[PDB]
Design an enzyme around this catalytic site. Structure first.
Site, PDB file in Angstrom:
ATOM      1  N   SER A   1       0.775  -1.233   0.000  1.00  0.00           N
ATOM      2  CA  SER A   1       0.000   0.000   0.000  1.00  0.00           C
ATOM      3  C   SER A   1       0.811   1.290   0.000  1.00  0.00           C
ATOM      4  CB  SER A   1      -0.987   0.023   1.159  1.00  0.00           C
ATOM      5  OG  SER A   1      -1.941  -1.016   1.013  1.00  0.00           O
TER       6      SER A   1
ATOM      7  N   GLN B   1     -11.173  -4.700   0.032  1.00  0.00           N
ATOM      8  CA  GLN B   1     -10.686  -5.498  -1.082  1.00  0.00           C
ATOM      9  C   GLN B   1     -11.668  -5.547  -2.240  1.00  0.00           C
ATOM     10  OE1 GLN B   1     -10.912  -7.652   2.151  1.00  0.00           O
ATOM     11  NE2 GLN B   1      -8.894  -8.619   2.262  1.00  0.00           N
TER      12      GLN B   1
ATOM     13  N   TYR C   1     -10.576   2.834   5.179  1.00  0.00           N
ATOM     14  CA  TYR C   1      -9.452   2.553   4.302  1.00  0.00           C
ATOM     15  C   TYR C   1      -9.802   1.434   3.319  1.00  0.00           C
ATOM     16  CZ  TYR C   1      -4.605   1.398   3.082  1.00  0.00           C
ATOM     17  OH  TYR C   1      -3.419   1.141   2.438  1.00  0.00           O
TER      18      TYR C   1
ATOM     19  N   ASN D   1      -8.828  -0.391  -0.741  1.00  0.00           N
ATOM     20  CA  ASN D   1      -8.220  -0.520  -2.065  1.00  0.00           C
ATOM     21  C   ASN D   1      -9.214  -0.208  -3.169  1.00  0.00           C
ATOM     22  OD1 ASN D   1      -5.795  -1.441  -1.018  1.00  0.00           O
ATOM     23  ND2 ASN D   1      -6.403  -3.588  -1.181  1.00  0.00           N
TER      24      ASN D   1
ATOM     25  N   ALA E   1       1.699  -3.276   2.919  1.00  0.00           N
ATOM     26  CA  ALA E   1       1.951  -4.695   3.018  1.00  0.00           C
ATOM     27  C   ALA E   1       1.462  -5.420   1.782  1.00  0.00           C
ATOM     28  CB  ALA E   1       1.273  -5.266   4.257  1.00  0.00           C
TER      29      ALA E   1
ATOM     30  N   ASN F   1       5.737  -9.466   6.127  1.00  0.00           N
ATOM     31  CA  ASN F   1       4.691  -8.571   6.607  1.00  0.00           C
ATOM     32  C   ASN F   1       4.575  -8.625   8.130  1.00  0.00           C
ATOM     33  OD1 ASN F   1       2.392  -7.042   7.038  1.00  0.00           O
ATOM     34  ND2 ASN F   1       0.991  -8.522   6.102  1.00  0.00           N
TER      35      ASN F   1
END
Length: 351
Positions: A61, A117, A147, A149, A308, A333
């Protein structure tokens, strides 16, 4: 390196590597604007390849900082506006929940609960449209941060549409090339595979898998040298010759929303410096306060981003007013708090 930098870096990072069982790590410290590099351990355990200054790590990220800056550059060019409705750039997005959702909301995770996701099942352009059409927001736009993606990923994809270029081509031409990030890749070329570290997850060597909006949200790979240059560029955008890129970097560090002690930028996140180190979860929904209008990049900031992938953990932090920054790239990670703690120890000692 100056002994002070040598000592605080080694004395912080060696125990971190031991405690977290990190196979390989690269660190850059930017001090008074100059980079100092450190490496430990293995890029590839089985093949006994060491981490070097040329080793590629998955940024995960931390890629979002590149997306935010590329978006900023597109704004500066007059190709898009953050105040534009999402539907201006994707007219096919006709479902009613999209009324009122702007590019700003996508860029800053405030659209109303877009999910973390993009589902694995979403592959084609048609699949992607269906996914966003069917998504039901939990909240009105501009009220809560989650947050995601799927949020900034869509921002990146739409931001480059007026340019005519693919996201990758736009990133290369408009960001990587002008900043001389010549070993930074969305897709690692075969020529560079010799330097591509393996990630390690539960002891297994892994690389990030392809996914929808991967390039935009988590797909950049880079070296410690290029990442140091990235930090330099974000510390001192005024030294950048390309006008719209200079502007884009500045826009990405503007403060758009506040949650607690944090301010959301484009990709970058910021806190006022000096920052309580204690001030720096699968799903964390937080109410946001709009900053009306956004505050231009504040020099007295802790500016940072964690990242990560399954096998990698990255962290970048810098303080513009001190000309000071750090990049930590690792092929495991490991917990975010350990990253922040180490970065703070190092930067606090040097500031």
């Amino acid at each position: 390196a100056p002994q002070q930098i040598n000592d605080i870096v080694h004395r912080t990072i060696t125990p971190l590597i031991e405690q977290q069982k990190i196979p390989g790590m690269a660190v850059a410290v930017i001090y008074q604007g100059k980079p100092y590099y450190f490496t430990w351990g293995y890029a590839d355990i089985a093949k006994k390849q060491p981490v070097t200054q040329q080793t590629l790590f998955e940024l995960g990220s931390v890629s979002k900082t590149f997306t935010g800056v590329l978006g900023g550059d597109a704004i500066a060019r007059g190709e898009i506006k953050l105040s534009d409705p999402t539907t201006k750039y994707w007219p096919e997005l006709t479902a009613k929940q999209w009324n009122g959702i702007t590019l700003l909301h996508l860029a800053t995770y405030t659209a109303g609960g877009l999910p973390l996701q993009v589902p694995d099942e979403v592959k084609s352009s048609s699949d992607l449209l269906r996914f966003y059409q069917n998504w039901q927001p939990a909240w009105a736009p501009g009220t809560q941060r989650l947050y995601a993606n799927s949020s900034i990923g869509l921002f990146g994809a739409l931001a480059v549409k007026p340019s005519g270029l693919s996201f990758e081509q736009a990133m290369q031409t408009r960001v990587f090339q002008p900043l001389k990030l010549n070993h930074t890749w969305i897709n690692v070329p075969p020529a560079e595979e010799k330097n591509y570290a393996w990630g390690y997850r539960e002891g297994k060597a892994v690389h990030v898998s392809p996914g929808a909006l991967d390039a935009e949200a988590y797909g950049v790979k880079s070296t410690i040298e290029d990442m140091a240059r990235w930090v330099q560029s974000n510390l001192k955008p005024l030294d950048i010759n390309e006008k719209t890129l200079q502007q884009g970097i500045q826009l990405a560090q503007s403060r758009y929303w506040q949650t607690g002690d944090m301010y959301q930028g484009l990709g970058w996140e910021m806190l006022d410096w000096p920052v309580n180190p204690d001030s720096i979860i699968a799903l964390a929904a937080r109410p946001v306060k709009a900053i009306t209008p956004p505050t231009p990049a504040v020099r007295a900031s802790w500016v940072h981003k964690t990242g990560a992938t399954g096998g990698f953990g990255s962290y970048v932090a810098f303080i513009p007013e001190k000309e000071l920054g750090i990049v930590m790239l690792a092929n495991k990670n490991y917990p975010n708090p350990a990253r922040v703690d180490a970065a703070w120890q190092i930067l606090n000692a040097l500031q």
